[PDB]
């Protein structure tokens, strides 16, 4: 909408390294998948104690988000001139082991206006894959594919570095509201940093005099 | 198409060694499968690092490509005159342990124009086989079969080494473009080799004079 | 014997839709919060300690 009406097919872009400096090939899928699903799974385990009766559970690991999507290829209808084996030559190639490197191709899936995991793209490597050819001709050039991709998370190590810089930075720079107080100024400054800054050490950092030297509009820093 | 309209059946060739030196028997099976299926799978394990800087998962092993395929035999329709036990005396033989060596037979499935995983053939050995006879005769010659094959990938070592040298054969021979520079010429040489070719070694291996010596059309050789 | 009591688990299924003409907020802005709050936070490296509530339930 808002400009024109034309289909935006999804694109499978593959690299060789994690960061994306070395590019492999790329392919755009005909016949958009009609369903995508992203499945989360966070594993817990119930902590045990013999003293108290408080009941909590322990965060163990976070199994990465998986993307399940299915594709269909056809080379029979008279708009479809290209064979489906040159199109499946790259789904089998880009979702398997690289020839020189032992690792797979890091497979960044994208769609025109769809945010995947709060980002415009979905990195990750193909966990499994299955092509099931359901229609042939006389010498059996294949004519249907029914591909069943599935991926994992595998974001780059840099992208993951900047996302924890926008959350809990090094320095806070909290403001001073009206009728303020240092037990409440150090309580909102300890929410930016998530590190529970004390009122006394917040007072020593700014070198303020009397534990009341804020004047409703000045900025005092927490570390 | 493009010449004629005769069918092309699938042929199951067998060997004894990993390579093609010692041929065993070889059958072609009538009544094509209607559907093939080859499943890929790659196993990953999540890094449970204590430092909690990053979430990632390692690559462990890639499971071999497995092919599933279902056949059917029948000899009572009056075009069908060969009894199906002579055609199943080969599938039961080639998908089992050979008497000579004590191993499977290293099968190779092929179809006329179908291109398997990236090659014109599908090598590998038989994981599974199940025949289920459904019709019989008065003396019970069977004459209906319904076979359910299942194979693995297992290619030979000469073919796998040949496909490796076709990608980064430890020389690059990188052309230079107009408005080029050695940090860019090392990124374009570090993509041919996938080895981070560290630009000071490029100017030493090619006898550059002053780190800007290439002239928009000459080649630079990059090894490792 | 009594060993341990497993934690109470809650199952719950939602639906979002933005093309009916009362629905104008795109559902990615509403799913940019569920995907965020039900995942590991960037600040500490842990989940977010959610709290589900209904008017009289």
């Amino acid at each position: 909408s808002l400009l024109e009406r034309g289909l935006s097919k999804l694109t499978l872009n593959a690299w060789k390294d994690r960061e994306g400096k070395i590019p492999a090939g790329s392919m755009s899928a005909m016949y958009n998948p009609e369903t995508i699903q992203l499945d989360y799974q966070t594993r817990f385990d119930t902590e045990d104690t013999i003293n108290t009766a408080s009941q909590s559970n322990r965060y163990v690991i976070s199994e990465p988000v998986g993307l399940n999507l299915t594709l269909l290829f056809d080379s029979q209808m008279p708009g479809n001139t290209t064979p489906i084996e040159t199109q499946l030559a790259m789904l089998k190639s880009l979702c398997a082991v690289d020839a020189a490197t032992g690792s797979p191709y890091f497979l960044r899936i994208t769609w025109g206006k769809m945010r995947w995991e709060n980002k415009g793209w979905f990195a990750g490597r193909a966990r499994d894959l299955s092509v099931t050819y359901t229609l042939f001709d006389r010498d059996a050039t294949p004519l249907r594919a029914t591909v069943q991709l599935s991926l994992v998370a595998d974001e780059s190590f840099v992208i993951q570095q900047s996302l924890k810089t926008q959350s809990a930075p090094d320095r806070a720079l909290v403001s001073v509201p009206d009728l303020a107080s240092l037990p409440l100024l150090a309580l909102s400054a300890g929410g930016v940093l998530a590190s529970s800054v004390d009122y006394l050490s917040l007072a020593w950092d700014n070198d303020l005099d009397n534990l009341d030297d804020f004047q409703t509009g000045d900025f005092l820093r927490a570390t």
Side-chain angles (χ1 to χ4, degrees), chain A:
Chain A
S1 68
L2 275 298
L3 273 302
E4 49 90 18
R5 51 187 179 94
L7 280 172
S8 67
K9 309 291 183 181
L10 58 77
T11 304
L12 181 61
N13 294 316
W15 281 269
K16 291 183 182 179
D17 54 354
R18 178 70 66 92
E19 297 297 327
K21 295 178 176 64
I22 302 167
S26 67
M27 63 178 289
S28 69
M30 60 185 286
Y31 293 159
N32 293 121
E34 169 199 1
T35 304
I36 60 97
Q37 58 178 355
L38 284 85
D39 196 355
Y40 270 101
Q41 184 72 42
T42 301
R43 296 184 185 273
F44 294 100
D45 192 75
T46 68
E47 68 94 19
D48 296 333
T49 186
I50 64 171
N51 303 320
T52 61
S54 66
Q55 294 180 356
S56 66
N57 54 7
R58 182 181 66 247
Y59 169 70
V60 174
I61 53 170
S62 179
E63 183 175 358
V65 53
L67 181 67
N68 290 311
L69 74 163
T70 180
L71 298 174
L72 186 140
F73 296 96
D74 180 78
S75 69
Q76 185 184 357
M77 293 298 166
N80 297 321
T81 61
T82 173
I84 58 101
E85 193 65 31
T86 66
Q87 290 175 349
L88 287 167
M90 297 182 75
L91 281 175
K92 297 175 183 179
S93 177
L94 301 174
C95 299
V97 178
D98 196 358
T101 311
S103 296
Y105 283 102
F106 289 103
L107 288 313
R108 179 171 173 177
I109 290 189
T110 152
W111 217 336
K113 285 295 309 178
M114 181 172 151
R115 291 189 81 70
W116 298 88
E117 182 55 39
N118 299 320
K119 297 179 291 293
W121 60 93
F122 183 79
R125 290 177 289 181
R127 184 173 61 240
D128 55 355
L129 179 68
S130 74
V131 290
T132 166
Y133 298 174
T134 62
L135 200 281
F136 302 94
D137 57 354
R138 303 293 296 173
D139 51 356
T141 302
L143 269 65
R144 302 288 167 86
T146 314
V147 189
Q148 192 69 42
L149 280 167
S150 176
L151 277 77
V152 296
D154 270 324
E155 197 33 297
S156 84
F157 283 140
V158 167
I159 290 296
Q160 291 179 354
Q161 179 64 38
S162 297
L163 289 171
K164 70 175 293 294
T165 299
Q166 286 103 18
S167 298
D170 53 356
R171 71 180 177 95
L173 199 277
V174 71
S175 178
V176 174
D178 195 2
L179 278 74
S181 63
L182 279 175
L184 277 74
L185 291 174
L187 190 66
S188 69
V192 175
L193 298 172
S195 295
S196 297
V197 294
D198 197 4
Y199 71 95
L200 192 62
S201 295
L202 181 66
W204 179 254
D205 193 4
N206 300 112
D207 286 331
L208 64 150
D209 301 330
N210 302 319
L211 294 178
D212 284 324
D213 205 4
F214 45 82
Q215 196 65 254
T216 179
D218 52 357
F219 293 154
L220 53 87
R221 292 184 290 115
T223 56

